[PDB]
Design a protein around this nucleic acid. Structure first.
Ligand SMILES: [Mg+2]
Ligand SMILES: [Mg+2]
Ligand SMILES: [Mg+2]
Ligand SMILES: [Mg+2]
Ligand SMILES: [Mg+2]
Ligand SMILES: [Mg+2]
Ligand SMILES: [Mg+2]
Ligand SMILES: [Mg+2]
Ligand SMILES: [Zn+2]
Ligand SMILES: [Zn+2]
Lengths: 102, 24, 83, 98, 70, 150, 160, 91
RNA sequence: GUGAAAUUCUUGGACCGGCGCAAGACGGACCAGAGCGAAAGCAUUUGCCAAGAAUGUUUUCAUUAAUCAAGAACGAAAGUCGGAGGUUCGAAGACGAUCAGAUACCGUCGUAGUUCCGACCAUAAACGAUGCCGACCGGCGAUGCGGCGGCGUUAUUCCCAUGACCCGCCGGGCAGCUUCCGGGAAACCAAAGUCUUUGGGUUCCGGGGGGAGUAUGGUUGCAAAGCUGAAACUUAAAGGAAUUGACGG
């Protein structure tokens, strides 16, 4: 049975999509199929922000960010729990989970 | 078996058969 | 709508429809009289002209071809032909 | 666009104007003073090219150096032989501006 | 930090580096603890920057097209 | 749908229902005939003659104003082209593709386009020989066609 | 610089040492990693240009420029993608207005005018009529050749 | 009629020397004995005289070329590269 | 380097940091259920060369058209031949681990290959597991290109053009959401609808599961192999979609 209408990928009007390597296991995954997470993390932990501020020679020093784009095969994506299996009707929606700001 | 490996086994047997027949 | 009058559509949707898909084919283009400044004569120019139209009495260009409509040079007046 | 323009104009010189094909006839027409344009393939020998240029300068007529060769000039003329030099007696098609 | 202090160095610029290349770009677990230990040991901290080697594009990453099966 | 493309475009010309000559058109039939004669002397194909006539001189349809089509007028006067316009242009395109191809052997896309163009050429030539516009023994050869176009 | 931006760095290679002082000269500039990675965002087109240009005094420089299409404040569409002709015209424009800030002047007044990235700012001003750009900078310059290292030039660059 | 199915010019070698060697020498011999269009006079009379020497019978022009072909791809790329380096060298 | 190790490199300065040099690959992020191409496939800049869809058209010809046995062009990757090149990765192979065994999964090394040109091969889950041309049959919001019409903002400029947004309409596309149109065994599909109320044109092709895409014959190929392709015999099921339960390192 056809599990997904888009066959688990975003390739619609293409013949071939270039492959990428999974950041976890270095598997060749098509670019439109791999799970992408753009992590924007503070370069220091939240426990150490105060200590770096104390030890800084500057007063108004903004801590730099760390920009990394991650690609996962669905095997590593499921095993690392970034994505989870969902019900038949719950597979259909594409809304990303909310940021949960408060 | 996996169908691909049955195909490979069949190809090996076919080359052996061709070699036997050509030997005559 | 099950009872849309296909015989007598109002002119608004008659205009918005494609030239071929109207009830009767009607071209979107027309003809115009172009007045060149500094000149007296009148040249009839196709609205969707594909060629650079020139005055025969003055070495001046009237319209420049574009994708859909010829673009008139500035300072030139134009009117319609029988609507 | 220049090459296709000169090829089309050369085609229209044929079938509508008086031309002449070849070296000896070109020189004959030039020294009679009725050759209004001389076209030279770049395959032409340098001595022949220079001599025809001098003849044209004496006759005060234009020389165009065709961006082809004798094979391609022959094809542009619509013939199935190589022509290396040609003259136009009268274009009839505004290749030669009045 | 104590070696730098006994050689008369008081402040440090920081250049965090991951493995880089075609391999991972995430810094290891030791970056946070190393930087925090530098900060709390009296050493002053200046500019901090990521200097991970990022290829404009790299050679083929090791493991094969099926990756690391585990 | 297109003959050799998977295109299904609709871009056409919508000829108006009024076949009558506009009242503001002062040019008579003989005037338009003489204009077509001059533009044919200049070397313009009937498509270009129609384009120039419509763009500048305001004539909507040469057939509507003269009663004859442009190619009919040229053929009656006796200066129609030896080859039909569209077949001439297709042979020209094939010659251009061949000239590009003999310098670029790896352009297999150009080879495919050349095959498509020559198939169109052969179909159109078969049609013209059916209508006896072309001689019954007329044939398009790749080698000798370059002397016919441009 | 006393109060300038902090995402810009300089190379400043050392040529001559006299006494206990190492005297430097310009070698190249570059943006920081965090700023560059923050500038690159989805649903927008970035234009990258480079040009090898020789200064009046013989320094050869490879200037790299980046620019990102800016969405309007009232724009509803998710993406701001420039067409290929627009990107090509922007690239050509910002190559020919990096050439002229280098060809007609010395290295010193090139360096002091790329300190506030005036070249990138006027590039941003010049491309508004094609497609708006917001993050325009000289991303990188690298020293390709140096002219024979005259000591007098180095000392006047340091001193007066 | 067609006299040979596939050997063509190397049918003179009979059954000797091996099929692959005959196939390898076939295109070399075809290019060796072919007549190329002269780039000076336009006639197709430029034929090999000795190894590396190509002579046109019409204009009596002798050109130094490849061993079996009139010009080698190596030499063509070299000529293009030398042209580019010349136009780069001057300004 | 790993789960842990070990093979391996290391006072001969290994790893690390700096400055350069060289080589061959690869073109991140921008990169999207976006574009183009007959498919395969195509992502650094610039230039050249031809080509093409869509749009605009009151331009031309006037049925020239659709599908197509035979035949022909192209055809991922792997594979073959010849010439260059060989950085990384890495079939084979060697070794270290793990294990009851481990010819594997993990690690180190590493040949062919992977890169370019030239010539073969013609196969992929070559997939949308879904022939092409044409007509009709719902709605909605987007998006790519072309065109047309509009309050306004914006760029220079003195104003219009022209760009960038905003609002619409049309035409062709990549798609999406929704719907008791309708169909279907259902999953689902606006096509897989307009089908017992059965006929728009046309091509290929299936007839229970195996034997078997096998044997043999023919034909193509350097080879590997490709195309065409049975029978004896055997078997009462094999399968598809959904439901409940059981189980899941
Ligand atoms: Mg399943
Ligand atoms: Mg595919
Ligand atoms: Mg697993
Ligand atoms: Mg291949
Ligand atoms: Mg080889
Ligand atoms: Mg290795
Ligand atoms: Mg049919
Ligand atoms: Mg059966
Ligand atoms: Zn993975
Ligand atoms: Zn010769």
């Amino acid at each position: 049975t056809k599990k997904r209408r888009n066959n688990g990928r975003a390739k619609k009007g293409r013949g071939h999509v270039q492959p990428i390597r999974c950041t976890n296991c270095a598997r060749c995954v098509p670019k439109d199929k791999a799970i992408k997470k753009f992590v924007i993390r503070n370069i220091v932990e939240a426990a150490a922000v105060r200590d770096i501020s104390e030890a800084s020679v500057f007063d108004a020093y903004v801590l730099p960010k760390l920009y990394v784009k991650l690609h996962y095969c669905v095997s590593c994506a499921i095993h690392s729990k970034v994505v989870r299996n969902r019900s038949r009707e719950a597979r259909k929606d594409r809304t990303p989970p909310p940021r949960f700001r408060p | 078996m996996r169908a691909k490996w049955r195909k490979k086994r069949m190809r090996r047997l076919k080359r052996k058969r061709r070699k036997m027949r050509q030997r005559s | 709508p099950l009872a849309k009058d296909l015989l007598h559509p109002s002119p608004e949707e008659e205009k918005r429809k494609h030239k071929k898909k109207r009830l009767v084919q009607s071209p979107n283009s027309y003809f115009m009289d172009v007045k060149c400044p500094g000149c007296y004569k009148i040249t009839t120019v196709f609205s969707h002209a594909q060629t650079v139209v020139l005055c025969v009495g003055c070495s001046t260009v009237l319209c420049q071809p574009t994708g859909g409509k010829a673009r008139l040079t500035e300072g030139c007046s134009f009117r319609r032909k029988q609507h | 666009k220049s090459l296709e323009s000169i090829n089309s104009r050369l085609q229209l010189v044929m079938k509508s104007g008086k031309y002449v094909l070849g070296y000896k006839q070109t020189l004959k027409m030039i020294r009679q003073g009725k050759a209004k344009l001389v076209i030279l393939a770049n395959n032409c020998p340098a001595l022949r090219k220079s001599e025809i240029e001098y003849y044209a300068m004496l006759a005060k007529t234009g020389v165009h150096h065709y961006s082809g060769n004798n094979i391609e000039l022959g094809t542009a003329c619509g013939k199935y032989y190589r022509v290396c030099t040609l003259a136009i007696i009268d274009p009839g098609d505004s290749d030669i501006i009045r | 930090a104590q070696r730098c202090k006994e050689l008369g160095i008081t402040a440090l610029h920081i250049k965090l580096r991951a493995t880089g290349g075609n391999r991972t770009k995430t810094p290891g677990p030791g970056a946070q603890s190393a930087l925090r230990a530098l900060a709390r040991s009296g050493m002053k901290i200046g500019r901090i920057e990521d200097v991970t080697p990022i290829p404009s594009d790299s050679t083929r990453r090791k493991g094969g097209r099926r990756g690391r099966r585990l | 749908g297109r003959m050799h493309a998977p295109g299904k475009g609709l871009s056409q010309s919508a000829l108006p229902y009024r076949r009558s000559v506009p009242t503001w058109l002062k040019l008579t039939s003989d005037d338009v005939k003489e204009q077509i004669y001059k533009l044919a002397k200049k070397g313009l194909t009937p498509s270009q003659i129609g384009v120039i006539l419509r763009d500048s001189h305001g004539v909507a349809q040469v057939r509507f104003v003269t009663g004859n089509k442009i190619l009919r007028i040229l053929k009656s006067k006796g200066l129609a082209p030896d080859l039909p316009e569209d077949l001439y242009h297709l042979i020209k395109k094939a010659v251009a593709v061949r000239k590009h191809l003999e310098r670029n052997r790896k352009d297999k896309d150009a080879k495919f386009r050349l095959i498509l163009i020559e198939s169109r050429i052969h179909r159109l030539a078969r049609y013209y020989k059916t209508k006896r516009v072309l001689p019954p023994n007329w044939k398009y050869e790749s080698s000798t066609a370059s002397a016919l176009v441009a | 610089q006393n109060d300038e931006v902090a995402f810009r760095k300089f190379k400043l290679i050392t040529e001559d040492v006299q006494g206990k002082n190492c005297l430097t000269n310009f070698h190249g500039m570059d943006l920081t990693r965090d700023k560059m990675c923050s500038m690159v965002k989805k649903w927008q087109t970035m234009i990258e240009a480079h040009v090898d240009v020789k200064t009046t005094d013989g320094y050869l420089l490879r200037l790299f420029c980046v620019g990102f299409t800016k969405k309007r404040n009232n724009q509803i569409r998710k993406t701001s993608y420039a067409q290929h002709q627009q990107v090509r015209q922007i690239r050509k424009k910002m190559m020919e207005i990096m050439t002229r800030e280098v060809q007609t002047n010395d290295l010193k007044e090139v360096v002091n005018k790329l300190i506030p990235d005036s070249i990138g700012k006027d590039i941003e001003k010049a491309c508004q009529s094609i497609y708006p750009l917001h993050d325009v900078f000289v991303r990188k310059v690298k020293m390709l050749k140096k002219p024979k290292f005259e000591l007098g030039k180095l000392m006047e660059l340091h001193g007066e | 009629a067609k006299r040979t199915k596939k050997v063509g010019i190397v049918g003179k070698y009979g059954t000797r020397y091996g099929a692959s060697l005959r196939k390898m020498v076939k295109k070399i011999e075809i290019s060796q004995h072919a007549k190329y269009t002269c780039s000076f006079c336009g006639k197709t009379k430029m034929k090999r005289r000795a190894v590396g020497i190509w002579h046109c019978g019409s204009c009596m022009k002798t050109v130094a070329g490849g061993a079996w072909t009139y010009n080698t791809t190596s030499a063509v790329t070299v000529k293009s590269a030398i042209r580019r380096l010349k136009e780069l060298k001057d300004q």
